[PDB]
């Protein structure tokens, strides 16, 4: 390598061969004059040492250093190791036609398309642009065309649009855990220099917008374009191959939006009136003549498909809330109603989307997802849920509780001072008393928040669930939990110790009031412990994943049906406590082995070679089934593969 000037950064390989050759030649020379045996032996020794080094430095005693201190890099080096060829240029490698930048939000896209910066596109598609150019003859030769692009003249942008119009790209994020970590999209040309990505797929990428970077690749071969559009465009991953549940579950902003858009007040504008149609419902809410949310009777209409795949109309009156109806306006035809009648928490809307899918196919579900997002942001911003200090309500009896605990601890202290008890059980008494006090505190604060709302009703007074912003953000399921809002309002209680055991004097003060020094000092190492543990945990997990893939690599579903009669007996699992997994979810999606009979004997219920989807599973729950012998990959009788019917539903489809 010629560096700056007529010098060269030395390569260990060159140095090693050079050493060996010097040694060999001096030796061969000595085999012309018959030096004594001690000489020739020490010489041969040198040479053997040399060759040993060349093949595999280090493996034989102290590695011969190189320039300054380093174990200079040998051939065995150049193969093995985290930087050798196998792991550095064969498994994964660098790639042309690619770019990287910062991502952002842009909530105005349909989720089969993500933004893309204009400069970046132009630079990605230089070839195709040249092509279309000297097709339409606006240019003549390549060199000229290159200069054209350099100029960035007028026609070029139109042509670039033309080549974009249908050609997907792949987006990627670095710590690529699972199959979702790569997806496809269709470009839409944008100013600026950032990538606008549809806000749903953030959850899938596990990628917030706090500066994380994503990379884009471009397919070239026509095969690959089809590959992308048929197997990698986000409109086919709404179900994680991890488990059956969906993955395009909406998240924090939108869930807050819905939760506010559907929740009963008790006495607000526009009450008790009745409304013919969600249409006029929305009309009211925009007019401002009625609450966004107030109990009200309306007429609604729904469609079922109890027929042989054909819809049946019906309609009725319902008792509900304006906003709830307005929500209803969107839902596609074939769905029940009570689904969107309750408070619509996170799990709620998740299950909602799920059932939508597994009754009405795909296209309706996608379009439904997008409508959910739009309406969610709209009404959220309309509401304006904000945090403010006043929200975090310090409880009243907190001081009383903590003083009580103080006194009782002091009494235990006197008891030990009277030598009755021993340090161990003393310690134990104290930890337990603080635990119980903590519980009482948590009860108090959560009570106050959840139920505080108490207002008249055109009658006298009445309590109800609250509109306190923080409790709302919690109960939705958007962010936080009892744990975290507890650390806000009530005392955060107890903290660990460098040993891993626990302190003998808990934190007595929450975050609304400030901590005094020593408390905060403790909390420091409290946090830092996990904060540093996270790296080791990361690494160890990753090593696990690698090892797994390299051992279960070559298993492929090649044959169709081994046609056999084995199986295993799935039963729902219990730990003598309650059932912890219901047979429904443990069996759902796998394939029968021996035809199940009714508990009424000799009354065979399901043929022995069927696949259990929802309706059959529900029939199982009907007839209150015990356990099922079921086909499983562990026992298929294929050769170099695994027969489909022994594997089951392809989750994600």
């Amino acid at each position: 390598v010629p560096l700056d000037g007529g010098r060269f950064a030395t390569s260990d390989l060159n140095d090693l061969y050079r050493r060996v050759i010097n040694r060999n030649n001096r030796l061969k020379r000595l085999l012309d004059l018959a030096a004594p045996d001690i000489i020739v032996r020490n010489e041969k020794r040198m040479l053997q040492e040399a060759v040993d080094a060349l093949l595999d430095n280090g493996r034989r005693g102290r590695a011969i250093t190189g320039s300054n201190k380093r174990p200079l890099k040998s051939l065995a080096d150049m193969i093995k190791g985290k930087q050798g060829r196998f792991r550095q240029n064969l498994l994964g490698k660098r790639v042309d036609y690619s770019g990287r930048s910062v991502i952002t939000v842009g909530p105005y896209l349909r989720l089969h398309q993500c933004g893309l910066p204009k400069k970046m596109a132009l630079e990605l598609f230089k070839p195709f642009i040249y092509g279309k150019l000297e097709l339409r003859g606006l240019a003549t030769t390549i060199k000229a065309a290159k200069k054209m692009v350099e100029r960035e003249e007028a026609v070029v942008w139109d042509i670039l649009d033309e080549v974009i119009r249908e050609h997907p790209v792949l987006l990627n994020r670095a710590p690529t855990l699972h199959r979702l970590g790569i997806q496809a999209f269709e470009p839409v040309l944008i100013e600026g220099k950032a990538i606008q990505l549809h806000p749903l797929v953030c959850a899938a990428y596990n990628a917030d917008f706090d500066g994380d970077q994503m990379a884009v690749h471009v397919p070239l071969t026509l095969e690959a374009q089809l590959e992308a559009r048929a197997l990698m465009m986000s409109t086919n991953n709404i179900l994680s191959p991890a488990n059956g549940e969906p993955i395009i579950v909406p998240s924090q902003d939108v869930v807050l939006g819905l939760y506010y858009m559907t929740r009963d007040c008790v006495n607000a504008k526009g009450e008790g009136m009745v409304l013919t149609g969600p249409k006029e419902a929305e009309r009211l809410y925009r007019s401002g003549l009625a609450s966004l949310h107030a109990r009200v009777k309306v007429r609604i209409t729904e469609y079922e498909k109890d027929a042989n795949g054909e819809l049946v109309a019906k309609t009725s009156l319902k008792d509900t809330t304006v906003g709830r109806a307005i929500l209803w306006m969107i839902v596609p035809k074939g769905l029940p109603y009570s689904i969107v009648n309750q408070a619509l928490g996170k799990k709620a809307i998740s299950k909602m989307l799920n059932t939508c899918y597994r009754i009405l196919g795909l296209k309706p579900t996608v379009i439904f997802a997008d409508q959910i997002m739009y309406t969610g942001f709209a009404y959220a911003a309309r509401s304006g849920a904000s945090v403010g200090i006043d929200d975090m309500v310090i409880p009243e009896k907190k001081h009383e509780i903590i003083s009580e605990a103080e006194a009782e601890v002091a009494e235990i202290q006197e008891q030990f001072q009277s030598g009755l008890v021993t340090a161990g059980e003393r310690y134990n008494k104290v930890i337990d008393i603080w635990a119980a006090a903590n519980d009482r505190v948590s009860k108090a604060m959560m009570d106050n928040l959840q139920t505080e709302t108490v207002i008249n009703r055109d009658g006298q007074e009445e309590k109800q669930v609250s509109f306190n912003s923080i409790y709302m953000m919690a109960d939705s399921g958007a962010r936080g939990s009892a744990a975290q809002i507890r650390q806000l309002a009530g005392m955060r209680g107890l903290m660990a110790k460098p040993d891993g055991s626990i302190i003998e004097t808990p934190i007595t003060a929450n975050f609304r009031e400030g901590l005094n020094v020593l408390q905060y000092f403790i909390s420091t190492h409290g946090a830092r412990k996990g904060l540093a543990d996270t790296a080791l945990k990361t690494a160890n997990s990753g090593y696990l994943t690698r090892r797994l893939v390299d051992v279960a690599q070559d298993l492929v579903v090649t044959e169709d049906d081994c046609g056999t009669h084995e199986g295993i007996m799935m039963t729902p699992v219990i730990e003598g406590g309650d059932v912890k997994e219901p047979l429904r979810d443990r069996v759902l999606g796998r394939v029968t082995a021996e035809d199940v009979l009714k508990p009424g004997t000799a009354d065979i219920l399901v043929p022995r070679n069927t696949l259990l989807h929802e309706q059959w599973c529900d029939l199982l729950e009907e007839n209150s089934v015990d356990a099922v012998k079921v086909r499983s990959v562990v026992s298929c009788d294929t050769d170099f593969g695994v027969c489909a019917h022994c594997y089951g539903r392809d989750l994600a489809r």
Binding site: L55, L75, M78, I79, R85, N89, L90, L91, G92, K93, R94, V95, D96, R100, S101, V102, T104, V105, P107, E123, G131, E134, R179, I182, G192, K193, A194, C202, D208, F209, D210, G211, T221, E223, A228, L256, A380, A381, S383, G384, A385, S386, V387, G388, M392, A478, Q484, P498, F511, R512, G514, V517, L518, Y520, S523, T524, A527, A532, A535, V549
Partner: protein, 1319 residues
């Protein structure tokens, strides 16, 4: 009372705890250490002196030739700081040393012959430290972090746990000197005591014991204790210290005075012992069987024939009893044992012993030290003598000796730097004692055992290495010296010394490239404390333990500031008040407690010293007279807090800040946030960028002033005085006579570093902030540096923000930013880049810099002068040419703008090795700088003389005043004006002599400077000229640049909305930034909300004032109002008596408030809710801190009252235009035909192993096939792909990966043979 400058903008201050000890200087570490490294100090004591007096004098090989030291001296730099940066050569200073070689006569005692005095021989230069603690190595600005590492001395560790899962614990002990080889003792689970040296192998410690010329009996006598049997007619009377048998049961019968006390099965009891010791007879009855279970102590031999009865280390038996009885030796020496008190460990190891003499001992020693050799006796002798007694190859520090003796409960703290038999033996005794469960192990983590070096230490150690390198050749030539016909400098060689020191500074795990983009960042990255580096440990060989914050970091090492990621708990920052002890430990201040009165006597304490006492926590009220208000109080004693009585206390805290670093003690309201976000916010704050304007953060913490002063990036006047001349370039101050020297009284000038380059390409700059003709006080601000304002630190700006979700545009954490902002240029910031284009003369000929270039555009050429280099001030974009460099073929190698980086060329630099044609533009530039510097020093002398004659006038006023003959005849003709010969006349002569001296020195400095600019400076070998350019981009803000608050609330601006669209208040003002509420209750950084409130309070006071003033209301109203505004609050130490100002002295305060009323907050003592509330109530804004808003889109009313206020946000320096990057088809790596890696190099991304997993996971096949072959490897197929593309035919053809081809070849190089079949 406040300084006039302070009066510019006083700051309101909450806070109760009265601060008694002010903040100390923030660079104590750097400056003190280095100032200590370089000084003319007597009596050795840690300097160049120390290293010298160590290494010298060098005596000959008895050739009577002694090379002695005399004295040293450091001259003055050939250059200075400015020109040094400009060129690139280091910033050093000559090293001149007085040595002297004397020669006696042979044949006699010290009969002298001759000496020679090579006065101040040169031995290569060492660098120096600017008065900002920064070095300058090669035009750069590097800094040496201070290292933390294990104190020398000795330690006693558990090694719990992994002990073979036998549930047992081991015990090791380590002696670790400051320079030499280590030493280790440890037990094996079979209770065997072993030593090792530097972790090679294991040997039985008795080996070294015997090695120190000891015998078996010597050793045993020394460790174990004596027990005597005495032969008699019968009953074998034994001697018994009673307490000896306090623990283990005596299975036989024991009587005294006939009276039995103990029998079989009788365990000895406390009353047993008491009555026995009351009896006190130590010649008592014994059986015979029990004795047989012992080990002989000494060595008995036959009565007459003296033949071996029994060697020591031998158990009793029948035959031994018989052969001693036939001797009848009335003395029997044995060694007591007690498994609960006293083990035979040593003697068992003695059993293990292979050898039995000093000689074979040392033999085995060498045989493990260096493997495989016949050991010469005296050779191994000298070797072992050379391990632990070399005055040179081995050394404890004085520090070592101290900590050592202290740990051994010795009495004194001085003596040998090397070991002793007594020392090692005592060590082993301590080890045994702990093995006996008395004496505690000692945790490493305890900062009573970590130690902080610094630059002083580093340079000293390295320099000493250099000297002992030279001394070899020194004594070589000396021993082979001639007859007096030589000279010292003949014998000496600066080459190795300079080599070592340069290697150290310019290349080290410590000496790192100083971050500079932000004043706080500088002053941090100077105080940092790392445990990496030489003589330390590695980024991977440390677990939970050394990372965790031991409970004694308190007040010494900040707990909450540390870079997360790979290395945590390794990059501690040194706390605010922390000081380096005399020895090197970290001591901290405390307040002395008398009987019941808190004296304001500060008092420093180390780590271990703190352990004894008990300390009161800062937040604790008191009755004005050192009386604690309560009588029980929380305190801490020994890693344990509790509540105590009143009389128990010892010492009290200093200030409620002393537990955090400057890296964190700016974060307002820290006391509310969690540690996680506290940390993240601290670092982000460290990464700010200087805006184009500073704007005094509304919500500060009173440390701002301190940091701004202590950094080096602002100008503090060294003497009080009066403004005499302001000018965007310079500032000129007349001094006050009371603080003036008689001679060269004169005045002072401060130049100002104008627009120039950081190490991070940010725009370091300075500005004046004083109007003409104004008083200034000794030690005050004059030149606000980058991101400074009127003397306080200011990083970002304050912005009217509002928490409310909005149409998704703030989905995860995405800030949304109104256009009002980007209009008013309040995040625009400057960047500078340095682009070089060297030129060489190499094979096939020389390069040239003509303006002519083949096959270019005259249009492009238009921006070039006839000399080739662009003018000063063009506006260039990408692709433009800056310098025409040509190659003999002839081919272009011109330097062009990097892609997509606009800007303007602000300055040019040219260098050319001497002996080469200075071309046209070079000459022009040279003459230009010449005129500049001439003007410069000329003006210096001119206005200096102006002031000097003014002072003359001042003098002539008294005594022989002559107004007419004064103001008329030329001021130079003031030698013979009428006045007496008073010392006033003498001082007139003083002024005149300094006049003439200014003249002459001005002359010589002019000349030398001319020659400096005239010469053609050096370069690398093989280069003709170098052309440096400077661009200057003006980055605006735009979608996708990380902004962030001071609480870890990160964010990425995403859409630039038009003024219409931002929500607006009921009164019209829009709101600038919109954050996302959903970000709070998880990242529990609740602080930012309170910050926002208190902000709005401030700005409310503001608008009130601004209205009042635009009303042109009278001053009385303002006095009343502002006075109220400060006087509010429950209780403070602030006290501003606005009734004590002039009417000018106030209106200015108003006009500096009208943007807002800054507010302070000590870290753990700041404001509280009710206080903020009442402040707002003084304002005219609702208590709840929330408002009803309106939506510009619909002009309707949002439903719930939302939160607005002012947050102080920062623009980080991850800028989209540097992250964004792409590639179509660039170069290809040379060894493997793969694309390169990086942005700088026009490389491409890395499609990684996990992505390949991903594609296999989908059914995708063709895609992966492509992205492994066509896009990447095959030369052939790659090109053919490109062709098929441009011809509009999307289709590939595989080929085989060249990389795999390479793998094959490498294996085939190894002895293997891998092939490829063919079916």
């Amino acid at each position: 009372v406040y300084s006039y400058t302070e009066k510019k903008r006083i700051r309101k201050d909450f806070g109760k705890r009265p601060q008694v000890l002010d903040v100390p200087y923030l660079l104590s570490i750097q400056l003190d250490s280095f100032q200590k490294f370089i000084e003319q100090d007597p009596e050795g004591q840690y300097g160049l002196e120390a290293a010298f007096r160590s290494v010298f004098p060098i005596q000959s090989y008895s050739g009577n030739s002694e090379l002695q030291y005399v004295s040293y001296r450091l001259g003055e730099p050939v250059f200075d700081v400015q020109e040094c940066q400009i060129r690139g050569v280091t910033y050093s200073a000559p090293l001149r040393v007085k040595l002297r070689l004397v020669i006696y006569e042979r044949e006699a005692p010290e009969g002298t012959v001759k000496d020679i005095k090579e006065q101040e021989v040169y031995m290569g230069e060492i660098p120096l430290m600017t008065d900002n603690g920064t070095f300058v190595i090669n035009g750069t600005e590097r800094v040496i972090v201070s290292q933390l590492h294990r104190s020398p001395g000795v330690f006693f560790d558990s090694d719990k746990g992994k002990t073979h899962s036998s549930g047992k614990v081991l015990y090791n002990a380590r002696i670790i000197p400051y320079r030499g080889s280590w030493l280790d003792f440890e037990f094996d689970p079979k209770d065997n005591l072993f030593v090792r040296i530097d972790r090679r192998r294991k040997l039985p410690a008795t080996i070294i014991l015997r090695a120190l010329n000891y015998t078996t009996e010597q050793i045993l006598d020394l460790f174990f204790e004596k027990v005597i049997f005495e032969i008699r007619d019968n009953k074998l009377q034994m001697e018994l210290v009673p307490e000896r048998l306090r623990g283990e049961t005596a299975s036989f019968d024991i009587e005294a005075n006939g009276k039995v006390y103990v029998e079989k099965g009788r365990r000895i009891t406390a009353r047993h012992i008491r009555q026995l010791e009351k009896d006190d007879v130590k010649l008592i009855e014994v059986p015979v069987e029990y004795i047989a279970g012992k080990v002989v102590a000494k060595d008995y031999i036959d009565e007459s024939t003296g033949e071996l009865i029994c060697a020591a280390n031998m158990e009793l038996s029948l035959d031994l009893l018989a052969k001693l009885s036939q001797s009848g030796h009335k003395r029997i020496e044995t060694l007591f044992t007690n498994d609960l008190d006293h083990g035979p460990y040593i003697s068992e190891t003695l059993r293990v012993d292979p050898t039995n003499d000093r000689l074979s001992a040392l033999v085995e020693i060498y045989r493990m030290m260096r493997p495989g050799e016949p050991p010469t006796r005296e050779a191994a002798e000298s070797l072992f003598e050379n391990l632990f007694f070399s005055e040179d190859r081995y050394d404890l520090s004085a520090v070592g000796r101290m900590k050592f003796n202290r740990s051994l409960l010795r009495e004194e703290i001085e003596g040998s730097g090397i070991l002793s038999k007594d020392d090692i033996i005592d060590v082993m005794k301590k080890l045994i004692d702990i093995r006996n469960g008395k004496g505690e192990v000692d945790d490493i983590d305890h900062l009573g055992n970590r130690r902080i070096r610094s630059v002083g230490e580093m340079a000293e150690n390295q320099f000493r290495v250099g000297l002992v390198r030279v001394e070899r050749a020194v004594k070589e030539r000396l021993s082979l010296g001639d007859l007096d016909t030589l000279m010292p400098q003949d014998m000496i060689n600066a080459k190795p010394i300079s080599a070592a020191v340069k290697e150290f500074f310019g290349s080290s795990q410590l000496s790192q490239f100083m971050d500079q983009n932000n004043p706080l960042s500088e002053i941090t990255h100077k105080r940092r404390i790392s445990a990496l580096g030489p003589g330390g440990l590695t980024r991977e060989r440390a677990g939970f333990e050394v990372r965790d914050v031991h409970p004694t970091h308190y007040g010494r090492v900040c707990p909450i500031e540390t870079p997360e990621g790979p290395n945590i708990g390794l990059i501690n920052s040194l706390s605010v008040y922390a000081q380096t002890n005399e020895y090197g430990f970290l001591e901290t201040p405390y307040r002395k407690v008398t009987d019941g009165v808190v004296t304001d006597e500060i008092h420093y304490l180390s780590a271990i010293e703190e352990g004894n006492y008990v300390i009161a926590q800062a937040n604790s009220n008191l009755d004005e007279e050192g009386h604690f208000v309560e009588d029980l109080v929380t305190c801490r004693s020994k890693g344990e807090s509790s509540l105590f009585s009143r009389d128990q206390v010892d010492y009290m805290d200093v200030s409620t800040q002393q537990v955090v670093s400057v890296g964190a003690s700016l974060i307002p309201f820290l006391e509310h946030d969690d540690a996680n976000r506290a940390l993240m916010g601290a670092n982000m704050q460290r990464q700010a960028v200087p805006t184009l304007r500073a704007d005094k953060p509304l919500v500060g913490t009173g440390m701002e002033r301190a940091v701004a002063v202590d950094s080096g990036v602002t100008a503090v006047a060294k003497r009080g005085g009066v403004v005499q001349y302001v000018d965007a370039s310079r500032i000129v101050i007349k001094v006050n006579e009371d603080e003036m020297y008689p001679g060269e009284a004169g005045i002072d000038i401060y130049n100002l570093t104008k627009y120039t380059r950081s190490n991070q390409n940010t725009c370091i700059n300075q500005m004046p902030c004083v109007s003409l003709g104004e008083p200034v006080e000794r030690g005050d601000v004059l030149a606000d540096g980058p991101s400074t304002d009127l003397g306080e630190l200011a990083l970002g700006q304050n912005m009217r923000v509002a928490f409310m979700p909005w149409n998704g545009y703030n989905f995860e954490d995405s800030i949304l930013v109104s256009e009002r902002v980007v209009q008013e240029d309040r995040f625009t910031t400057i960047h500078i880049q340095e682009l070089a284009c060297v030129s060489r003369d190499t094979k096939l000929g020389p390069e040239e810099i003509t303006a002519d270039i083949p096959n270019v555009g005259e249009a492009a050429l238009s921006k070039l002068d006839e000399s080739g280099i662009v003018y000063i001030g063009a506006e260039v974009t990408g692709g433009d040419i800056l310098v025409g460099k040509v190659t003999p073929k002839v081919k272009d190698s011109s330097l062009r703008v990097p892609n997509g980086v606009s800007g303007t060329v602000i300055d040019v630099q040219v260098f050319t090795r001497d002996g080469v044609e200075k071309d046209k533009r070079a000459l022009e530039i040279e003459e230009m700088q010449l005129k500049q510097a001439k003007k410069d020093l000329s003006e210096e002398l001119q206005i200096l003389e102006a002031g000097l004659f003014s002072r003359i006038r001042a003098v002539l006023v008294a005594g022989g005043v002559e107004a007419e003959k004064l103001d008329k005849l030329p001021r130079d003709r003031w030698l013979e004006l009428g006045l007496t010969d008073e010392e006033k006349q003498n001082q007139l002569e003083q002024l005149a002599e300094q006049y003439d001296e200014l003249k002459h020195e001005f002359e010589k400095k002019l000349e030398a400077k001319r020659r400096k600019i005239t010469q053609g400076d050096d370069l690398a070998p093989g280069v003709l000229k170098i052309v440096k350019v400077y661009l200057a981009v003006k980055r605006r803000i735009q979608p996708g640049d990380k902004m962030a608050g001071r609480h870890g609330n990160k964010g990425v601006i995403s859409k630039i909305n038009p003024i219409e669209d931002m929500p607006y208040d009921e009164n019209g003002t829009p709101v600038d930034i919109v954050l996302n509420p959903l970000g709070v209750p998880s990242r529990m950084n609740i602080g930012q909300i309170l910050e926002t409130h208190l902000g709005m309070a401030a700005k409310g006071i503001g608008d009130k004032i601004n209205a009042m003033l635009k009303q042109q209301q009278e001053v009385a109203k303002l006095r009343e109002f502002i006075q109220r505004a400060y006087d509010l609050g429950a209780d403070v130490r602030q006290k501003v008596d606005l009734s004590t100002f002039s009417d000018e002295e106030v209106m200015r305060l108003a006009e500096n408030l009208r943007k807002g009323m800054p507010i302070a907050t000590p870290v753990f003592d700041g404001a509280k809710e009710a206080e903020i509330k009442e402040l707002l109530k003084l304002g005219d804004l609702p208590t709840s801190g929330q408002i009803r808003l309106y939506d510009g889109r619909t002009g309707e009313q949002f439903e719930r009252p939302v939160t607005v206020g002012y947050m102080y946000m920062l623009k980080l320096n991850h800028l989209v235009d540097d992250k964004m990057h792409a590639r179509s088809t660039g170069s290809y790596s040379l060894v493997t035909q793969q694309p390169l890696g990086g942005k700088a190099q026009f490389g491409g991304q890395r499609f990684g192993e996990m992505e390949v997993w991903a594609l296999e996971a989908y059914g995708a096949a063709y895609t992966l096939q492509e992205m492994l072959t066509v896009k990447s490897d095959d030369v052939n197929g790659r090109t053919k792909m490109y062709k098929n593309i441009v011809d509009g035919n999307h289709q590939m053809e595989p080929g085989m990966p060249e990389s795999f081809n390479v793998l094959l070849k490498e294996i085939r190089s190894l002895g293997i043979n891998i092939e490829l079949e063919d079916e």
